[PDB]
Amino acid sequence: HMCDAFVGTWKLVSSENFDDYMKEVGVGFATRKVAGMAKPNMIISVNGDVITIKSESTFKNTEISFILGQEFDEVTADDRKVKSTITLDGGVLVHVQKWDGKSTTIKRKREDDKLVVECVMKGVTSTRVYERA
């Protein structure tokens, strides 16, 4: 009953500061413009100890499956090849991505009826709000 309140299908409803986050990450102009337009659906499921997060949009369809605390390799939607580790910290899913000596953290939290996603790169934070589909 690990992660029960995250499971389901979620749709992006608002975003703030995501272009600046993507700049901080090193995403180029054209990818930023197309990615910034996307309205993804985030589909979260659990089977035993394995969590799957799918992100589907007109920009890209991605899928990750993982066990909490167990590193995995991920190709991100913007084509970074990263080493990722996802843990649960006080009810928040914390996703750390490492590549080229850099690091970014993506937090997913349940707040009221929303799933709030915070993406942080250095001093730049972006908040993306998802609602149930």
Ligand SMILES: COc1ccccc1Nc1ccccc1C(=O)O
């Ligand atoms: C952590 O995600 C990113 C970081 C940098 C650049 C892009 C992304 N990924 C996205 C951006 C917009 C819409 C959907 C996604 C997705 O992942 O499906």
